[PDB]
Write a protein that binds this ligand. Structure first.
Ligand code: HH2
Ligand code: K
Ligand code: K
Ligand code: MN
Ligand code: MN
Ligand code: MN
Lengths: 248, 251
């Protein structure tokens, strides 16, 4: 019933990572998204693995931002819960098998096809739904697949503005939607100037509120506390609204 | 047009000017100055004490490039302020405390915020009682000479209402917005935001849930928000206005 808060942990110390994870859990993170990725599968594993081994025992879900089944599989043997795939299984078809094999969840982020024929929304829907079908025919449950519009990838300024004005249509596919705009160019431009990254937390929080109201079920963010608490408030307001209107 | 940010200035004079400057920098469109409260159980003061507290501050900030609103329910304090060039009179009694208010406000061509207050022992639903009351007062503000597009309605979250009644109102902000008078939401760090937190915090820690009420309220159509943390809310309001314009522009 509650909006999930996926915290961002970029791994580009294991000790500092661990301390940061507890700090994030503390600020309200439901999922800790670890990511460290052109480098070698081996190099990617050299950065991501030591962290995953240290934090996977904690009482929080661990997502791993990777697009290669080899990185996803070593992580899943350690007990990881989600594979946040920026390519939506396009980069390595074997991602679907690795995930099915460990009864995990997977995020399918819209990416590629930058010079698309069709308008961005029809294309994103077509591609993402096509990837969802592949996930399932691999044996991954329907309810373990998330869709991500992929703000910041293979889309022009105009295309993303279109995508952000029609989030309801992605939500309408009934798959749980993860919004991930945090501190991106799109948020930089909401501010209207060349802001530094951190300066983008408040507009990012705006996307969270707006997205939750459009039906997004999770938000991927750098500033956990701000979004965790802004989301709590918005969730509260919608529920209160349903209650007082006897809407369900 | 954007959502206006009315910063709260609770009332020495230099200390106040400092805080007004900062609020302007954080994005404040209006600075709302008050020295009184209409909460039963709170200190009551004289018109004269309100003046000593309020007038020297208004005098020193009315020149700035920001609108000034004065939170008062007595027209003598109002006029004293309108004579210094103040732009808005924020009335916790919607002109029911002092019946000369609308005439004073319209005399200096100002704006007025009519806040829902009183009759906490009503037996009809809060919402229809508030609408009936606020619209009757508004109708009276126009008779006196205040144009409709300068009469604001405020649901008075935190005044003469039960937790049950505040939740009723927050779930139906659009009905107030539907009246077509510009709407000001003022929930900052109040008890309602404390329920949202679901626990006890110092006032400052209620800022994020206050900001959620801002995002939500803008979605519902309110035109301004009265807040303590101007920056968090000004920056948030800005993102929401953009998301909303973008969505309307694209449809
Ligand atoms: N128009 C309007 N004016 C108001 N003035 C004072 C308070 C609450 O007063 P207090 O409890 O003293 O706190 P603060 O002055 O910080 O808001 N609330 C409103 C309000 O909801 N709407
Ligand atoms: K875990
Ligand atoms: K001024
Ligand atoms: Mn639409
Ligand atoms: Mn006050
Ligand atoms: Mn309704």
């Amino acid at each position: 019933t509650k909006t999930k808060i996926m915290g961002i942990l970029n791994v580009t110390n294991v000790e500092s990572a661990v301390t940061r994870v507890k700090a994030m859990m503390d600020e309200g993170a439901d999922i800790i998204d670890v990511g460290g990725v052109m480098i070698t599968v081996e190099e990617e594993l050299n950065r991501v693995l030591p962290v995953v081994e240290a934090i996977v025992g904690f009482d929080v879900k661990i997502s791993v931002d990777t697009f290669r089944s080899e990185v996803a599989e070593a992580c899943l043997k350690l007990g990881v819960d989600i594979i946040n795939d920026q390519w939506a299984g396009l980069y390595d078809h074997r991602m679907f098998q690795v995930v099915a094999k460990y009864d995990a969840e997977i995020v399918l982020m819209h990416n590629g096809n930058g010079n698309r024929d069709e308008p961005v929304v029809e294309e994103m829907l077509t591609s993402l739904l096509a990837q969802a079908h592949q996930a399932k025919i691999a044996g991954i449950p329907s309810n373990k697949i998330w869709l991500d519009p992929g703000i910041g990838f293979a889309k022009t300024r105009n295309e993303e503005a279109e995508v952000m004005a029609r989030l309801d249509e992605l939500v309408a596919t009934e798959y749980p939607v993860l919004l991930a705009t945090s501190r991106k160019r799109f948020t930089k431009e909401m501010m209207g100037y060349d802001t530094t990254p951190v300066e983008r937390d408040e507009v990012t929080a705006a996307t969270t509120a707006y997205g939750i109201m459009k039906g997004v079920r999770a938000v991927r963010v750098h500033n956990v506390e701000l979004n965790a608490k802004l989301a709590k408030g918005i969730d509260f307001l919608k529920e209160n609204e349903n209650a007082r209107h006897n809407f369900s």
